[PDB]
Structures are given as C-alpha cells and as structure tokens.
Amino acid sequence: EDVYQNFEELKNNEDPSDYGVVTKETGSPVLVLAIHGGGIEGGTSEVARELSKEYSMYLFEGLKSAGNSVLHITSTHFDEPRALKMTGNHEYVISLHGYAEEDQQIEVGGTDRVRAADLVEKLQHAGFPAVLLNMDHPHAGVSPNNIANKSKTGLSIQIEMSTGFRKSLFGIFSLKSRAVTQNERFYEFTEVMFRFLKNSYL
C-alpha cells in the first residue's frame, strides 16, 4: 500500500518543499521517466538527469530528510499533471525504478517486448547484470493504467535496478551527494544506455 492514491492527495498532504517535479522537453521521440526519484528510489534521479543530456525527461523526486517512502505513488496510480502531459507528448517511454535487493541486478520489463529483450542483451554483453521479465511476471509494467504506457504508441521499457546495483554507481549514496560523486561505473552504464537508445529508436 502507498500512502496516497493519486497526486492530488499527495499535494494536499505534503509541504511542497518536500518533493519536486522536474521536466526537460526536447521533442525527442523517447521520454525518460523517473516517478520515484530523490530519496524514494535513490539513484533514479541521477540516472534520469544524465540521460536528459540527450532525451526528454520527467522526474518526480522525494526531497525529505527522511520518510520519502510516503511519497511513492505506484505507476498505475501516478497522475501528476505534468507527467500526463509529457507522456502523451512522446512516442516511447523508458521508466526508471529501484527495488530492494543487495545483490547487483537489473530487471527489465515493459510493453515493448522487442526493445526490452534487445536492451537486456546489450546490458549482458556489456557485463551488466540484467534479466528480462516476461508478461506474467508481477509488476511487469504492462497495465494501460501505468503512467509509462500513456504515450502515443503505448510502448515502454521498465528498468528496475536493485539497491546493490544503484549503490555501485556513486561514491556517496545520499540525497545530497549522489549527484556529485558519480563514478566510472555510472558513466559506463549510462553510456551503454545512450548507445542503446540512439540505435533502437531511429
């Protein structure tokens, strides 16, 4: 269970300084979506911001010193108005998430089954620990209600990164310091992502 059922409820309950909505609109067909940034799923803000160097981005970030889990709205309920706008304005969506696991692992899902498999292959070739989840796996990112699918095509890739994998990319794993301690692994990973994104969405 999430604390809030939708964005309006979160907005009416939380101080606006405790969260932030951040957008970058470039007209790229692909949108990078991170609805659980900041302290909600740590590291997803930094990955999103780096990818926004070449692609449009939507970021919702939890900015509390503690307790950011209360700001998590599951994807099938996430309706913040700028997210609805940006998703509908784009052809395709890549949606970044974190989950709790100490081992390094990347779980890839979504509605775009061909591109999801291709991403997994490209990550595995590059030495990253990715697996493809199929249609019946729980939380596969396939619901029409999932924000990531509310695009012009309906085709998404869901990237779920374990705690271990996310912590491997930063010198200091904090709200304050991830953004200024990205390591060589961070850039290696984001580069694999930039190569995939440019080749897969011509």
For Zn ion, the binding residues (CB under 5 A) are 36, 41, 97
The alpha helices in 52-183, defined as continuous H runs, are 81-88, 113-125, 163-167
- Kindly tell me which of 48 and 119 has the beta carbon lying closer to Zn ion: 48
- Kindly tell me which of 158 and 190 has the beta carbon lying closer to Zn ion: 158
Q: How far apart are CA 63 and CA 70, in angstroms?
A: 11
The tokens for 19 are 């969260």
Q: How far is the CB of 36 from Zn ion (least distance, A)?
A: 4
- Of 149, 157, 164, the C-alpha closest to 105 is 164
Task: Give 3-state DSSP helix, strand, coil % of the chain, rounded to 5.
Answer: 35, 25, 40
Residues 176, 117 contacting (CB under 8 angstroms): no
- Kindly tell me which of 3 and 126 has the beta carbon lying closer to Zn ion: 3
- Kindly tell me which of 20 and 29 has the beta carbon lying closer to Zn ion: 20
